[PDB]
Write a protein that binds this DNA or RNA. Structure first.
Ligand SMILES: [Zn+2]
Length: 134
RNA sequence: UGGGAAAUGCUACGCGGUAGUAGCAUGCUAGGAGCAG
C-alpha cells in the first residue's frame, strides 16, 4: 500500500493522508462485493443513509424517518477519537464477517474463508510503503 | 315497355409512406467542476 500526503483546506494544522491500493485487490473486491454495496446505496428510508441526497427535500425525509414514535424524545450524538487508527482488529474481522453472510449459495465454506484471509492480508495488516521503505 | 358500366378532371375526407422543421421526455457516453466522510 502506497501512502501520500493530501492537499486540501482545513482548520487544524495536523497532516492528512491518502493510501492507494494495488490493482488486483480492487478488481477482486469489486467483483465480490459490488452487488450488496449497490443494494445498500439504493434503498431509501432505513438505518443506514449511505446514498441519500440532501437535496430535493431528502434531508427532511431523513429527519422525519428518525423521528419515529418516541414518547419523550431527545437528541444525542457522540464522537470517536481516532476511529481509523485505533479500531481493534477483532471488530474489523467481525465487520467483514457480517458483509459476507449474504453469500450462502454463490460460495462454499472454504471459498468464504479464503476470501476473508485475502481481505485480512490486503487491507487489515500488511506492508505499507511510506517514504521510500517498507 | 316505370331496367345503366368504364376509362378524365375537381373537391372533400381518412390512411400510409417519404422528406424536412419544431417541441417534449428519457437513455448512454464523454468532459469539466463543487460538497461530504
Ligand atoms: Zn460469492
Amino acid at each position: 500500500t502506497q501512502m501520500n500526503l493530501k492537499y486540501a483546506i482545513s482548520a487544524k494544522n495536523r497532516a492528512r493522508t491518502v493510501a492507494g491500493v494495488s490493482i488486483c485487490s480492487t478488481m477482486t473486491n469489486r467483483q465480490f462485493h459490488q452487488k450488496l454495496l449497490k443494494s445498500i446505496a439504493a434503498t431509501r428510508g432505513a438505518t443506514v443513509v449511505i446514498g441519500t441526497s440532501k437535496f430535493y427535500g431528502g434531508w427532511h425525509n431523513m429527519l422525519k424517518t428518525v423521528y419515529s414514535d418516541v414518547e419523550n424524545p431527545h437528541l444525542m450524538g457522540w464522537d470517536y477519537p481516532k476511529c481509523d487508527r485505533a479500531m481493534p482488529n477483532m471488530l474489523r474481522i467481525m465487520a467483514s464477517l457480517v458483509l459476507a453472510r449474504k453469500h450462502t449459495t454463490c460460495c462454499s465454506l472454504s471459498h468464504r474463508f479464503y476470501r476473508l484471509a485475502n481481505e485480512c492480508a490486503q487491507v487489515l495488516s500488511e506492508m505499507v510503503m511510506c517514504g521510500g521503505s517498507l
